[PDB]
């Protein structure tokens, strides 16, 4: 079929989510294929050999790894249907800046704030506020980062949002109330059908976590 | 150009030295401005208040921090001269993989080598080699990453190459026996105008490490 999709995924990642979201934005058909990750299957290791993680996008038999990558390769290959990025060279290197800052950021503060105790708990706990706040900032008055539609850092820091109820619970932290106007954003992502399908509920993931609190280093 | 372009830079970055080849591979005309990063100017921070970093461009007054992305600006800007990134989206997307790879591990892997002690050092050490191996494989029978011209991955890679003098010495590892073929990649590299021109001596660089062997935690 005259063109294959397969995704190697693992439901709660949120770098998974930012692929699921991008297809889902280009209305691209695919395949999706859970991984067990205690369990990782050899076609999982044969596609990314070298970092041995989802997500892992196949395009027609060949693999694109790193989420940031894939949803780059769909939008420069799906070039026809709703563009993530802008055209413009400084506008996309801003885009790709914000994009990487989530990247470099989000995940691993995020994960520091339960690893963590006493007073570095604390200390990472002011610095992901922080990173909210200017990235609502960076949005200010928006509908989306991407402006009136999706863009790439929408896709890039959306799925996060998922995993908001672990990180104010183990992580001991009020989000909404700090951090309103970044709710309040999410929840404008999670009225498109792309996000919508793509993102599990905060309860399912919440419950997922503590499943997982001995992998996860909680706490 | 006419184009005012200026790069914030810390001489022995090996960050800063990916963006000084882009741009002498480029042909472009700049200005360096060294940073003492023990006392970062208020340009600096100016410029990079997310990160507080170097390399920043600084183009027509506009920053582009984070390496990477600046090399990518380069190369989408100044798109009538020396072509860096491939066109076809799938090689992209690899090129952008191999620079993500090493942009991850080399410089973290290389420090570990002399952060840590004992049993957990020869892990470090034995990780690192493990990925310069990756790296030659990837190479193949190649004459550059990027083929018979420097391309992104070699311009994000051969930087690298200043503190391996560092890494041998401090971390007890004999990288010109085990990875011969890496070591006369980049030699090659070193052979061109623009590589020359932006990196300095192993000697140079070891020095200088051991001058900022507190800042580096050896170790
Ligand atoms: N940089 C990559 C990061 C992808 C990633 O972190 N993937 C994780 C799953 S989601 C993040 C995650 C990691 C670990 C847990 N856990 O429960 O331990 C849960 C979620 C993975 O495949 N890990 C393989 C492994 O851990 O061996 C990208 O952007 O694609
Ligand atoms: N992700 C960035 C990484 C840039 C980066 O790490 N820059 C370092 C200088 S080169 C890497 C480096 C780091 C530290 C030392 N040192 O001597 O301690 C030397 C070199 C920096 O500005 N650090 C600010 C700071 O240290 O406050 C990129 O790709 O541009
Ligand atoms: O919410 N989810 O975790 C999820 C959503 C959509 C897919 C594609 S089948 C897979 C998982
Ligand atoms: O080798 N170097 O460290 C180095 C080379 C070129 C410049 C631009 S003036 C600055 C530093």
Redesign the interface.
């Given at each position: 079929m005259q063109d294959e999709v397969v995704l190697l995924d693992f439901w709660p990642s949120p770098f998974g989510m930012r692929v699921r979201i991008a297809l889902a934005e280009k209305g691209i058909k695919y395949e999706y294929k859970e991984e067990d990750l205690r369990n990782k299957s050899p076609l999982l290791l044969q596609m990314n050999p070298?970092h041995k993680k989802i997500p892992v996008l196949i395009?027609n038999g060949?693999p694109?790894?790193?989420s940031l990558?894939?949803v780059?390769?769909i939008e420069?290959?799906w070039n026809d249907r709703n563009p993530l990025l802008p055209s413009d060279?400084?506008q996309?290197?801003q885009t790709?800046?914000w994009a990487?800052?989530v990247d470099k950021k989000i995940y691993d503060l995020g994960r520091k704030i339960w690893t963590s105790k006493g007073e570095e708990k604390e200390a990472a706990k002011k610095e992901f506020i922080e990173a909210l706040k200017?990235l609502e900032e960076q949005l200010g008055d928006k509908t989306y980062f991407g402006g009136d539609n999706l863009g790439f850092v929408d896709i890039a820091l959306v799925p996060f949002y998922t995993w908001f109820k672990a990180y104010e619970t183990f992580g001991t932290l009020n989000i909404e109330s700090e951090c309103p106007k970044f709710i309040a954003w999410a929840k404008r992502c999670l009225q498109k059908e792309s996000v919508a399908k793509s993102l599990p509920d905060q309860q399912k993931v919440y419950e997922f976590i503590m499943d997982l609190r001995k992998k996860l280093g909680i706490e």
């Open positions: 070298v395009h060949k694109i790894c790193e990558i894939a780059q390769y420069e290959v060279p400084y996309r290197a790709r800046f990487d800052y200017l």
